[PDB]
Amino acid sequence: VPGLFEGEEFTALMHACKETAQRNGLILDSEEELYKYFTSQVRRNLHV
């Protein structure tokens, strides 16, 4: 959701992203590479 996460939110989100990435054995630094990871994770965990 474009904009849903921005500013203050985007901070915790990004960190929690690389925190999860390291676990799954995936090294992600750039915020753009991290977002793709976050987006994909939701695509296969939400189910509306």
Q: How were these coordinates obtained?
A: X-ray
Q: Are 5 and 16 in contact (CB under 8 A)?
A: no
Side chain identity at residue 20, one-letter code:
T
Give the resolution in Å: 3.8
Please, what sign has the CA dihedral across residues 7, 9, 15, 20? Answer: negative
- Running DSSP on this structure, what letter comes out for residue 7? T
Helices 8-23 and 31-43: angle between axes, nearest 10 degrees = 80
